[PDB]
Amino acid sequence: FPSAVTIKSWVDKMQEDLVTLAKTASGVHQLVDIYEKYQDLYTVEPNNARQLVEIAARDIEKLLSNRSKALVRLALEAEKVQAAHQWREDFASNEVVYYNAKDDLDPEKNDSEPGSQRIKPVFIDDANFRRQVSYQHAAVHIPTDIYEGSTIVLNELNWTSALDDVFKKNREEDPSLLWQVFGSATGLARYYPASPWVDNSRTPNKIDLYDVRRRPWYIQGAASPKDMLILVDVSGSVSGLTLKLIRTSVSEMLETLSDDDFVNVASFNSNAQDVSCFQHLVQANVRNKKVLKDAVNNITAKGITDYKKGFSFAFEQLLNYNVSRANCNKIIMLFTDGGEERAQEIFAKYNKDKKVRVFTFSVGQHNYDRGPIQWMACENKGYYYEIPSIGAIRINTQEYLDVLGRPMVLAGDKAKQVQWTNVYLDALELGLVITGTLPVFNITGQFENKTNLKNQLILGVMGVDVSLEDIKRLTPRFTLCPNGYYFAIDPNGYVLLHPNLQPKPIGVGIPTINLRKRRPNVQNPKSQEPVTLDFLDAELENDIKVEIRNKMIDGESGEKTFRTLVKSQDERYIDKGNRTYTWTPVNGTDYSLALVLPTYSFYYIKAKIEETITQARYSETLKPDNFEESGYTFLAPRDYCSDLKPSDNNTEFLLNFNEFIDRKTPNNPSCNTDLINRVLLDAGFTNELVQNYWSKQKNIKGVKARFVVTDGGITRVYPKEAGENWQENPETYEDSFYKRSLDNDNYVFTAPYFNKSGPGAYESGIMVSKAVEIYIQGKLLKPAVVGIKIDVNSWIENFTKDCKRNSDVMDCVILDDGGFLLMANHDDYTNQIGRFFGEIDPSLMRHLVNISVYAFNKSYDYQSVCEPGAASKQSCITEQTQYFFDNDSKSFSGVLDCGNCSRIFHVEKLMNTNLIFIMVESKGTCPCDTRLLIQAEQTSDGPDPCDMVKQPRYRKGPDVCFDNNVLEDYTDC
């Protein structure tokens, strides 16, 4: 076995070859100098990370205020218009003319329902809604199993007909406005502008199950948070149909809860116990509700019914005050069938003052006495519901919000505060939106104080959607390097704005589908939950990020500069980077906004090209025909002008951009002149590099391609025939290698993919990259990244020249930080180049982890697509692993004992790059193996929530709470 000095000299020469090749063939110094030699076509401008955050916070506050002022118009108009309604019952003569959404647009139908008449709209096609929309009237949605033609529904379509002219006025005062909706307490949803629903019930086969009363914005604006305890009866009498109905009912009742509510499900039969692992009230988020549903669906019925034990258990659960709670609405929901005990002793002992409400549900078709259950309901300020079948579950389990809203109505204008929802997916396919809500009160006989009987409930909720791409435009990110970004936070941890928030739903557990128990044409329900992704689940989690999170949850302004681990774009690598977080509170609302900037991104370049000579010359440089002298060019599909749109076909977009820039000189009264000026200056610099330096040596020995990817949005590859193998995003802010090379101060080697259907191993090469680094007047700047595609064969033939092709005495490989094979020695390894080393020799990889040359970090991706297990694609959690270099040592000599065996190895880190050389005794010597070491998304189920509940993340609750009014009625049950 070679000595340390021979191996050190081997890797010294081997790394000098690679580094010199890349340095002399990419052109880092030439580009640095042509960036520094001009110094007058641009100016270096500062990035004030406090001023930026304050300006963005003010724009967000202004947007949400403009949306709040359009809600207090609709609420006022709705209250005034309904107060003056007449309540006729004779419509078959004076019809109600309206547009029923989810009705077929065929002109040869002519429904003309009794008492109503239809509208056939024109449905122009609009932007800001990727669907056909009519600004002339409002559309109406009525749930499928609610007859349109009742006297309750026709009396709603009559007075709600006056909202249309306020919808129109709101839209014409601020044309940036998305959906405006009134959701009625009768099921109606009247929204503007008009647009056909996504699912007609039976016109196509797929039926729709959309009730406005179960939407998050409606429930959020209809009542204050709650401390629910669900008390389930699992005595013997409930076995059969009523136990199955109780299970479905408890699931549908849990689906009406949000993240500001707290819940626990208990169960009693001669003995009361928690039905799950929770033991107290938990936060009622998607994971906790998943646990509670899975625990409810395992209930079996046996024993004697003892209401006193269950109610003692419930009232003691609602008295903890040691755990985090909502502390607003203490309610008990008793799901039973019928009995003879009413337990007046327990109610007098426990809620003599009636601070806790009771809602009782009698489930099933049975012969038992219901009187005591209604008494429990009518006495403790609650209500009584009957669920005889599956069809009653939805409407009876969402109606308690009517009772909970009486104290909010009795507060008047103190209770009309706008609220903003979590992030969820618009039902009309607009992506991620938040909705501002406002509850509408019933005031008939208000200036003479007549009724106060039907006036204890709300009429509905008014809402207005705000898309996240409307907020992502008030935080422009194109003056920050690819690594800086804005992100906002709830007073709950959840994220309103993040690069790692996706339009997919949050997955819980591992999906499990049964194929032997699914009819073909049954129209399964899909989902209704919001996309609540915590801030600590979107990034990697230090203990400094936890304190930043908690520090900006309680509305504090601040700044912190530290050193953290950042995961790459393609989740394969991890980098140790310096970051600066600067956060502030959004004043009008309860959001907080932070900006993350890496130092080296405190200054940016601002173009100063205003000479038509140089501007036109630079614009000449990017036309496809002339590519053969400048190299294949890609342009970033940003929004340079409001006219041209990002086409996602980059030659399409490039020709559009060229004909736009020449068809209208750079005056462009309504374009974004700074972006186009940066693009032009950038293309000029890059073309100068390609002409003066790259074009001299048309071909180099080992090089396969030469690329420049820069800020501004210019990609250039020198041989056009290499431009056909470019797989990178044309937007330079998604290029993983760009953001990776910005962090490191050396050459970064990217590892290709393994078993990838396409040219990715030998036709393309191994990608080396390095960031351009200039000093203008004492200010660091990294405006571009140059690189190289290295030919695999040339590298092999320099590698072989104790390690010879297919030698069977020792293996000599080259990996990068991440454990991916880049240069093998066996023609069996080297065919799978770009594969994780723990998959072709797990023993040495595990030992390398043990001896502390590789470290690793594990994370959870909560929005993943997944193949359903055995118990097209569903949503699941995946566990991800990433390996990197922790110890900064250079050499590692040792021996691994497989048991009965031993293999000596030496590893040495090629300095000034991210590569490591390993020479180990051949695996063919010893017949040892333990198990593969996989680095890939493994569909997981953890973390275990029964443990997170005992140490939950910090969180602030709402402080407005409308319960416990003294002049309520509760003569209703």
Partner: protein, 48 residues
């Protein structure tokens, strides 16, 4: 009322009106099995 009393608790949603849950219903069931009408479905519920 002893053999099949409170034992028709099948989880499915199909209604079985001729059961033995109380005394008037047991009387009705026994009389219907006496008249011979549909006694086989009463027997099948008793077997299941």
């Amino acid at each position: 009322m002893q053999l099949f009393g409170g034992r028709y608790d099948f989880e499915d949603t199909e209604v079985r009106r001729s059961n033995f849950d109380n005394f008037p219903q047991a009387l009705i069931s026994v009389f219907q099995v006496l008249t011979g009408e549909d006694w086989n479905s009463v027997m099948y519920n008793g077997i299941m």
